[PDB]
Amino acid sequence: RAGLKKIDEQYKKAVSSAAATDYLLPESNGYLEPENELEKTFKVQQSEIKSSVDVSTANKALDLSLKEFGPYHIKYAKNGTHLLITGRKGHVASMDWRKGQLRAELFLNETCHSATYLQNEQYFAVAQKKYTFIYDHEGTELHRLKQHIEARHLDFLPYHYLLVTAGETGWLKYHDVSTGQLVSELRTKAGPTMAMAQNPWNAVMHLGHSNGTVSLWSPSMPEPLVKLLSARGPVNSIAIDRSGYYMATTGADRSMKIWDIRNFKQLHSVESLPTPGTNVSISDTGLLALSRGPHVTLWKDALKLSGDSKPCFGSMGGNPHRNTPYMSHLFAGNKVENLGFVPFEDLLGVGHQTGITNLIVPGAGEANYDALELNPFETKKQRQEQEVRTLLNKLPADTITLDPNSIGSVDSGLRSFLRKKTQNVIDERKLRVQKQLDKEKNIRKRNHQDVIEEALSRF
Amino acid sequence: KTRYYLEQCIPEMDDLVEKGLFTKNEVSLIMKKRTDFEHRLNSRGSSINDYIKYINYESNVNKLRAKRCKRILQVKKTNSLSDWSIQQRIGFIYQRGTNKFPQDLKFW
Amino acid sequence: VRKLKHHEQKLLKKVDFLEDYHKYNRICGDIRRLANKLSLLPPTDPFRRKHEQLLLDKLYAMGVLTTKS
Amino acid sequence: MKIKTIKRSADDYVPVKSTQESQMPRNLNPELHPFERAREYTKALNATKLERMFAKPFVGQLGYGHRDGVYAIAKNYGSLNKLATGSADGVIKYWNMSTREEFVSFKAHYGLVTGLCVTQPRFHKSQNFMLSCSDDKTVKLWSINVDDYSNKNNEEGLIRTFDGESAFQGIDSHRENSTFATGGAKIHLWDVNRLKPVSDLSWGADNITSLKFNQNETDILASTGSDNSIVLYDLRTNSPTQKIVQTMRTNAICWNPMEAFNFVTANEDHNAYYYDMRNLSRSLNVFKDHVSAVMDVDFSPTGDEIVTGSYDKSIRIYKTNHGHSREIYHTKRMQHVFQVKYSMDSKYIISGSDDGNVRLWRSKAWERSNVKTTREKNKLEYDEKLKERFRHMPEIKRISRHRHVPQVIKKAQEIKNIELSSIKRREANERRTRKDMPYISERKKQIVGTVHKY
Amino acid sequence: FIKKVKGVVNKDKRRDKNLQNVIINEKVNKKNLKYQSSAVPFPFENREQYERSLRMPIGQEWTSRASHQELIKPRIMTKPGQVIDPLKAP
Amino acid sequence: PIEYLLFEEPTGYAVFKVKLQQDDIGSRLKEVQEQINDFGAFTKLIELV
RNA sequence: UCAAAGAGUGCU
């Protein structure tokens, strides 16, 4: 009791001290509070929001008209300082979207599917046609990954320095950027991969397939960790929140499902989608984004176990319980390709046919980042020191498990021929001796636990 | 060790909010100013004028607290950490400045 | 990345991932491989004797072999 | 309506002055810090790897050593950098371990220097004193001029001689007062201001090979006999108190500087035994790693560690609570360790071998003697608790426990392990039929008998 | 003659039982021996106490500055350049 | 065991207080000899009173 | 100029 109790106060005193440091957070998140009961938050338009917000916030809501090499897939850097755009016809650009500084621009005459940044913005990978290429900060080709073929989805695990690829061959492959060796290559055996998402809490990969299932993968295991049936047709998109507690999927059957992936319990099944969903994203604050062709719809406080938190399109006579859309926006005559919430910003990046747009979404980003992990105001000296120390503390690939808290639990001539005979006899005696010892133990357990026949019992 | 000094302010700030003298929003503004001063004191090129500014700012926080005590609590002295926290802090700034700049007779 | 200190080098090594004669190297290696597989074949095979001579003639004609070999 | 968005003031995050330090905002929300378990483990593994590449325990040797083997080391318990050594040449030296140079060297005895102790005689700052005994049957008191203080400005040399009828084999001084004890053919009690022994202590006719005063209960003394016995004495009663006989001889005794009733013994059966004074029928612990006789043993002044020197040419360090050494130190030039001591700061180990050299070692090989910044001391402290948390991890054991052991010691251990398992399998066979063969506690096998039963 | 062969998990002990639309492969979810402690480290006297400690992360990414200092402070602390004298009479 | 230091200058007498005492057995080790040269490390040893 | 990489100086 004393030993087990004393540990409890040591634990309780630590958590209280950590909570007490919340008084030092330099800022607070945004919101879209309605004043009057008639005023509805999903009637607010980007024109109105730009008017109210300050100059810098309005300048962040970038729009880029690219009519030629679309549609465009976006990806923001983990600290939100750099934007990576890839046109389907092969226009790939890397830039710092605040200071208007272009770090690279490639005009590959090829079909590009997706691109991602590596451990920082100095390096990125592009899933081009038939191969995946890695580039420098300035756009110089470093490597062509010959093993990664027909990859359509890319992701980077930052704490593991791993690059993940998936495509139509049904191959999930892990590549170590630090060492440049194929860590693991797994056969999905489910056909082409329709969607891919990492869980940032345990670094497990979630693949969607055409059979309506979502499988969970780790580099060191040859079979999926878990399989979830979350659609009656192919799964188009998968989104996982920062805590790694919830998962959102959209299939090609006008279905959207919110999952509890710690316990593997389905929470909501929104079947009222007018058209199939194309993309889903979850922000740091937990806002749920959905795109249906030219529409973008947001929900607030939807990732909860309560039944009232179920997302709803519209409202039934203004019923309070129904979770109406938090915000909405329509790109008339323009389809949405993908959605990216800007880290540590109240912005939602949207890649579409015409180019790139950032929508101002109050209460979308994490207002208070931690500079030890990610720093939007990082200097190059801090960037390169952070590069070395994150490389020193690289987590091995085989530490990836469903539960991240698994680690740390108690648990000649004739002479050769004559030598052979003796060793055979020596081994035989060991078996004979062990048989007697086993028999003696059996006796210990046995001991521990007609009138004519009686007469002749002595014989 | 700038964070060591910032965390010493937390128990006082919590006491201010509990007693109702300052709101959480207002307390955040106060700690934002303190964070800037602490970095200024702990950097290169720091002068005695930086300490004087931080002492002057802390004194004004004390005056504002004293007025909200009678205006809100309607008490001369609320028995809690907030009463003597600022005065203790100000004396600590004076010690740090004098040790850093023993030449300045004005600060002494 | 930046130059690694002494202790960083010991802990982690070979992390420096991410005029070239690669193509000509491939040609020289491919010629060596083709000559090697030819040697594996029985010496008396007319097929073997014909193709090695063709390889000598091609390289002679290309000029990489200044004299017959 | 009410519209509020994330708004960053650049001045808060990017200071206007180029010399000011940029604010480093922190958010302790666990959602921003994944993989706590894996990261802490990986840091521990790296700290274990760093500890091996920084383990450099040898620091140097004192001067040119002794002409003959060193068989007596005496530390000054009140001075940190001062050391007294004697050799079989008959020579005794007083050292300045800071400069690694001698204050003075004396040709003290014709025979072997069989004992040495530093004292502060109270005859009825500028000078230090040391007592030496030998088998030439004399004890000599010497004075050394030292440079600790400059309050004055000599008489450096032999001050007094005590003649004995028999050869002297060991010497120790009472901490509080001026009396000292010598153990030869009889254990004698002496006063500085008398030339004949003041009291005669002896259990019987057997001779005394070594003796050590207690450090806290200063009136209690322990001695070792040639008949494999340990005798306890008390000066308040001027009598021996208890006697236990062991299966083999004990070479050295050290009292715990932090527990007045605990002492450790260096034994000839490869073992060091930890004993409680009040109950000597069993041992508190056994230290088991050496492959030859243990010749000397010493406590760290913090009382949490012991160091053992052995005839197998190695020095081992143990935690008092654990029966296996955490460390082994060795060199090709070290030949038979007869003395080991801890510096009074507990940071260094002094050894004296029979090749004639007095070496200095780091008590912890990966530590260093320079002053550190708080940012070092925090990082090094963090690694220690982190290594302590994950000691029994399969990788961290492999890196941490690995040592380069000399091939002689490794082979002697393997032969020793076979011998023990041969004994165990034979006693296991005997128990299948023998009705009354008692279990013998490992902590009691070495005791052959005790005089006063309880 | 029938021999019972132990499997990965009994059909009645599976985690995915009572979870609809979920398949959990217990064969790939086995814990790795590479990361299991061989024994309970000192000073924890019980396995349960050891497992409680691991829940608390010592690092500063998960702890405040002041709370970090208490956790990393070693039990035995001494100051350089002074002789540690034997314990005086209480 | 040093607590105060006396230095004589052409301009006057300066008294310093020894804050931390350097290792004596390890005095000749290079790292402690380097600390004497480095001002940042030296200021941790003494301070002017 | 920016942009990535070194090597010394001052200072906390």
Helix and strand numbers (H, E) in chain B are 5, 0
Name residues 67-86 of chain E within 8 A of F (Cβ). Answer: 79-82
The CA–C1' separation of F18 and G12, in angstroms, is 22
Long-range contacts of A72-75, Cβ-Cβ distance < 8 Å, separation of 24 or more: A72/A337, A72/A351, A72/A352, A72/A353, A72/A355, A72/A356, A73/A113, A73/A114, A73/A115, A73/A337, A73/A338, A73/A351, A74/A338, A74/A340, A74/A349, A74/A350, A74/A351, A74/A356, A75/A114, A75/A115, A75/A116, A75/A117, A75/A340
Among D320, D336, D310, CA closest to D413: D310
d(CA C2, CA A179): 16
Give D356's contacts (C-beta < 8 A, 6+ positions apart). D65, D66, D67, D68, D69, D70, D87
DSSP state of E52: H
Contact flag for B and C (3+ C-beta pairs < 8 Å): no
**Neighbour count for residue E89 (Cβ, 10 Å):** 6
Residue D142 contacts residue D100 (beta carbons within 8 Å): no
Read off the tokens for D64.
Answer: 């040119």
Backbone φ and ψ of C8, nearest 5°: -65, -40
What is the enclosing helix (H) or strand (E) of A40?
Answer: none
Residue type, A10: Q
Interface of E with D (CB under 8 A): 33-42, 53-54, 57-64, 68-69, 71-74, 76, 78, 80-87, 89
Read off the tokens for C21.
Answer: 């004669």
d(CA D41, CA E54): 10
Among A225, A224, A189, CA closest to A210: A189
The CA–C1' separation of F39 and G11, in angstroms, is 11
Give me the residue from A23, A26, A28 closest to B14, CB to CB: A23
Residues from chain E contacting residue D369 (CB–CB below 8 Å): 80
Residues after which chain D is discontinuous, using a C–N cutoff of 2.5 Å: 124, 153
d(CA D62, CA D94): 10
* Per-residue CB contacts under 7 A with strand G, chain C residues 3-22: 3
Q: How far is CA F48 from CA A67, A155, E82, F7, in A?
A: 72, 59, 22, 10
Inter-axis angle of helices E47-55 and A2-20, nearest 10: 0
Read off the tokens for D292.
Answer: 């030859």
Residues from chain F contacting residue D97 (CB–CB below 8 Å): 24-25
D323 vs E: CB within 8 A: no
Residues from chain B contacting residue E64 (CB–CB below 8 Å): 7
Looking across all nucleic acid strands, the nucleotide with the smallest C1' to CA distance from residue A136 is G4
Among D117, D128, D284, D140, CA closest to D210: D117
3-class secondary structure for chain D? Answer: CCCECCCCCHHHHCCCCCCCCCCCCCCCCHHHCCCHHHHHHHHHHHHHHHHHHCCCCEEEECCCCCCCCEEEEEECCCCCCEEEEEECCCEEEEEECCCCEEEEEEECCCCCEEEEEEECCCCCCCEEEEEEEECCCEEEEEEEECCCCCCCCCCCEEEEEEECCCCEEEEEECCCCCCEEEEECCEEEECCCCCCCCEEECCCCCCEEEEEECCCCCCEEEEEECCCEEEEEECCCCEEEEEEEECCCEEEEEECCCCCCEEEEEECCCCEEEEECCCCCCCCEEECCCCCCEEEEEECCCCCEEEEEECCCCEEEEECCCCCEEEEECCCCCCCEEEEEECCCCCEEEEEECCCCEEEEECCCCCCCCCCCHHHHHHHHHHHHHHHHCCCCHHHHHHHHCCCCCHHHHHHHHHHHHHHHHHHHHHHHHCCCCCCCCCCCCCCCCEEEECCCC
Answer yes or no: do D345 and F25 touch at CB < 8 A: yes
Beta strand pairing status for D325-329 and A347-352? unpaired
The string of DSSP codes covering A385-404 is HHHHHHHHTPPPGGG--SST
The CA–C1' separation of A74 and G4, in angstroms, is 24
d(CA D91, CA D108): 6
Which residues pair with residue D200 across a beta bridge? D188
The string of DSSP codes covering A205-270 is EEEE-TTSEEEEE-TT-SS-SEEEE--SS-EEEEEE-TTS-EEEEEETTTEEEEEETTTTEEEEEE
User: Nucleotides of chain G within 7 Å of a protein C-beta?
Assistant: 2-7, 10-12
Looking across all nucleic acid strands, the nucleotide with the smallest C1' to CA distance from residue A101 is G2
Please state whether strand G lies within 7 Å of residue B43 at its CB atom: yes
Q: How far is CA D101 from CA D60, D78, D447, E81, in A?
A: 12, 19, 44, 19
Residue B32 contacts residue D11 (beta carbons within 8 Å): no
Can you give the resolution of this entry in Å? 2.7
Q: Would you say the C-alpha torsion A290, A292, A297, A300 has a positive or negative sign?
A: negative
**Neighbour count for residue D97 (Cβ, 10 Å):** 25
Give me the residue from D33, D80, D257 closest to E86, CB to CB: D257
Looking across all nucleic acid strands, the nucleotide with the smallest C1' to CA distance from residue A121 is G4
Among B45, B59, B41, CA closest to B97: B41
3-class secondary structure for B39-53? Answer: HHHCCCCCCHHHHHH
Answer yes or no: do D384 and E40 touch at CB < 8 A: no
E65 vs B: CB within 8 A: yes
D394 vs A: CB within 8 A: no
